[PDB]
Symmetry: D2
Subunit: 209 residues, 4 copies
């Protein structure tokens, strides 16, 4: 409408004012996330192969995300896969609310499972800070999910060089923050994941219930 | 590695050099696509809610994409959904090749079905230009797929304002090109889709077999 | 109520009164007579997936992972897709009603309908559903034969044969629909022959 | 070969020698005795989905659309999830082997295993699979009760009851696993009671 017309005009102004690339990372981010990964990481266009979904998930049986991972790893020979969460995540907030929002809630049930898996931790935390912790923990679980896929396990098994990263983008300072799960093998995945969960579980004393 | 370290340094330099938003569009683009939609459309961060998958598909039964559409429409009350293809699409090229690339090929079978659906047209075209035409036709079919979802049909049925757009981004000039399918109702979807296919089917005489 | 209490009774009475699988069977959730009774097979002979309108959707993780497990792990050499007459899913896909989530699943059947719309448009309205049911089976064997899983099994020399039949409640006989693949070449040939044959209408069927 | 030719023979001989559905049945593809025989029901009483390890995955379009169609369209008031003993999918999920694509499907079972790892770690190794099979059924009824489809049916006042049983080949009896929901509150209560009960081990089961 007025909005579609302003989009076309903005595209035209941009194109006029401006006047092959091997991808080296697969980027899995969130549909809410507001700043684009290419801006954020200030890399040259085409360096990132990008999948975005709600709450940056790697669901075991999601054909969309799984096929993107298989194509990146087996076909494009991409050596780095990055899961990037972000602060003030609508998806995560959506997952925590009581509301039945319809079909999307079925997608967010995987986050709710991650909530209950870490319920003891999240339950010793004051209610108002749980959404920040869950965003962090979710990134860690998605890297773990990624490292458990048949695709990633097979790539590692045949000696293909492949690393998995889990970061959170904080808009309040523009920095990427490593959540500590970083895998180059099934063994490093296990140790790194367990270490990260343990580190995340040390709560700041001023919000312990 | 050297690449992850340069990413962190680039993020830091960017953040230091730099020193709430209602989304109004759902953007469905392609994982290959190299220029980001926010750059391309020069809109302010947070205006776009973004899903990217390989070859910018709306597959009937894709829970990932369908749930993003349902959340955008029913929850975020987004009034515009845009499917954006792009020139030199790896996904489309991947779909046309003979190679069994593995799991991803199952995802690209939907494009191959779109190929055979328009085979007569694509077969009267010289082989070397078919990938450009298929990229265009695919955008048109995905808008059609989108307008046929239970989610979109129900939104229109209850009088919710919602428009569907199908564009192609051409990097060779930076312009967004309307492929002509634009729906605000099931009826406009049908007419617009049929019109677009018919228009796309008029071939340039110098590459007719 | 009584309903569930009755099942436990009927079961307890049934049990009181009373194996390598070699086929993967993909049938329909509205099917009413089991494949095991239908085929009079020994229990455990069949590894069974049932879904609405006996579909092999390109990107259905549920059915694909069933296929992969049957083929790569169980080493099954026969995959049978069975449609049937008076199929509720096929009739649901042909109706114009918004049924909700299921309509998205049934859009794949509607694409097939469109694909063979000329064939179908020259048929009597009361015959069209049974024709779409037959075409559906052919199209799903075709989909199955086009999976990376099946193609990769053939490439590597594994013995695997795909079948597409329709069970008719009326007379209780399975009728072969003619798409039978032991390879990608035989898939293509038999799919195309199956459809070409379905396109030869008897005047009883013609509108 | 003879195999397929034999099926048509066995079928032709079977047919020569020889209904509103009220339940949605979610069973396992490795199940061997059909639900219809098992329950001694009339043909067409059961609307059947079978998949590997009788799962209701949150985001499985295949099973969810089956559920939605059963509930919103067919108006079925009972959804029965049936696991069984000697389940090949459960055993496959417990093994450490890369089976390929199917392993991704089975990771959901492995998450459940982890969820109840303490309960399971105190069990005899030869008993663990049958315990995971029982827990699986409870967890899937729970998943089913948490779908937007089922929750929305309850919200709006529709009569719908969820059940979770295990069929034992040994003695042929269905055994109720105790998670039975007619509402979200009764889901929570009965799920928690089911698991609490499963956590009371008999010394025969204890390692
Ligand atoms: Zn987010
Ligand atoms: Zn592309
Ligand atoms: Zn049927
Ligand atoms: Zn089983």
């Amino acid at each position: 409408m007025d909005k579609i017309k302003q989009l076309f005009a903005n595209n035209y102004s941009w194109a006029q004012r401006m006047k092959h690339q091997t991808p080296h990372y697969l980027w899995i981010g969130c549909s809410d996330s507001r700043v684009p990964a290419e801006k954020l990481t200030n890399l040259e266009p085409g360096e990132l192969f990008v999948h975005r979904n709600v709450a940056n998930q790697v669901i075991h049986t999601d054909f969309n995300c799984l096929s993107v991972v298989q194509y990146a790893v087996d076909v494009l020979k991409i050596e780095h896969i990055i899961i990037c969460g972000h602060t003030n995540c609508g998806g995560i907030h959506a997952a925590m609310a009581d509301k039945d929002l319809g079909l999307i809630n079925n997608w967010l049930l995987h986050i709710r499972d991650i909530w209950f898996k870490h319920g003891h931790l999240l339950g010793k935390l004051s209610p108002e800070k749980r959404a920040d912790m869950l965003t962090k923990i979710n990134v860690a679980e998605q890297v773990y999910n990624l490292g458990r896929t048949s695709i990633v396990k097979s790539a590692w098994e045949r000696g293909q060089k492949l690393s998995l990263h889990g970061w959170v983008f904080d808009v309040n300072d523009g920095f990427l923050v490593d959540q500590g799960v970083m895998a180059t093998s099934r063994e490093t995945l296990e140790i790194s994941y367990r270490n990260a969960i343990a580190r995340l579980s040390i709560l700041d004393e001023e919000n312990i219930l």
